[PDB]
Design a protein around this ligand. Structure first.
Ligand code: PF8
Ligand code: MG
Ligand code: ZN
Length: 305
């Protein structure tokens, strides 16, 4: 059962899930129980599922099991602070989607898989890794005793899997730019309609981006340390690009590491700030994410000065 400090602090947008890996499954179950009810899933099935998901995350620097639970926590915080907006099915689906959204990640981008001519790029030409993450999700659900959705009707099963698929695919950051552009237009013209499924899907897409990127919404010590892990992957990919005979983009080139503060500035400006700004416009209770993002932006500016 959850420690008093965790029960309190888990409700903060900037909660960090800690270094104790064995505690993370219980943290996830607690979040499920609080958003979805303790009758939502059979506990044994749920526990079995979570442990098989863990097993299919790799020991990479950033796109790992810790990332999965962290993304799920951010989703929990959004859902908790936006009571009555999302359906029981959406809430279950979105939390499970976040837990599964990077399944079997190798620590390489879609672009690298394409340049490598990896068999996954042949199977899934666009959003390669994300299509794979969804495939892994389905495969796990299909294992004996793992169908946490077995109490749903056939129709609800299909429905939740579609919610999950859309949510996982939305974590392809390539898609964020177009999605955010559409949403911002809908906001400003007052045409955003949460009862319109296509609009609803976009909002959920943006939520998935917000959650995926949430390391930039933590307090500075957490954010600064996390940046070490993301670049560890990117620089390794840069090395691999060099080995293919291809000059990596500066973000992936360890030789350009002194330029990290300027690169961060670019990212906050082009992606992070616009993301949380748009999210806050649609879901005002999510403002703490934007506040923390702006604070981290200032810290990078301070590093530069
Ligand atoms: C030289 C040196 C560094 C450079 N960096 C950049 C942009 O760097 C990033 C880093 C991470 C991410 C990111 N993508 N998805 C989640 C994250 C993330 C996760 C945790 N913390 C920060 C970002 C996006 C951009 C550009 C040019 C550069 C040139
Ligand atoms: Mg991903
Ligand atoms: Zn992710």
């Amino acid at each position: 059962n959850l420690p008093a400090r965790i029960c309190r602090d888990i409700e903060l947008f900037h909660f960090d899930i800690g270094p104790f890996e064995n505690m993370w499954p219980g943290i996830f179950v607690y979040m499920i129980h609080r958003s979805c009810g303790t009758s939502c899933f059979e506990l044994e099935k749920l526990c079995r599922f979570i442990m098989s998901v863990k097993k299919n995350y790799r020991r990479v620097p950033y796109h790992n099991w810790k990332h999965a639970v962290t993304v799920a926590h951010c989703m929990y915080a959004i859902l908790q602070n936006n009571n009555g907006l999302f359906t029981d099915l959406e809430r279950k689906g979105l939390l499970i989607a976040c837990l599964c959204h990077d399944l079997d990640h190798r620590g390489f981008s879609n672009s690298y898989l394409q340049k490598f001519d990896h068999p996954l790029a042949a199977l899934y030409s666009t959003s390669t890794m994300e299509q794979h993450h969804f495939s892994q999700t389905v495969s796990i659900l299909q294992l004996e005793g793992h169908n946490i959705f077995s109490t749903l009707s056939s129709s609800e099963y299909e429905q939740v899997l579609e919610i999950i698929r859309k949510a996982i695919i939305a974590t392809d950051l390539a898609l964020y730019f177009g999605n955010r552009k559409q949403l911002e237009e809908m906001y400003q013209t007052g045409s955003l309609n949460l009862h319109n499924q296509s609009h609803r899907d976009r909002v959920i897409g943006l939520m998935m981006t917000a959650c995926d990127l949430c390391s930039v919404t933590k307090l500075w010590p957490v954010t600064k340390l996390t940046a070490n892990d993301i670049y560890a992957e990117f620089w390794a990919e840069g090395d691999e690009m060099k080995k293919l005979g291809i000059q990596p983009i500066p973000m992936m080139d360890r030789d350009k590491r002194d330029e990290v503060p300027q690169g961060q500035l670019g990212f906050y400006n082009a992606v992070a700030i616009p993301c949380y700004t748009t999210l806050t416009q649609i879901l005002p209770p999510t403002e703490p994410l934007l506040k923390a993002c702006r604070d981290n932006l200032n810290q990078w500016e301070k590093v530069i000065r």
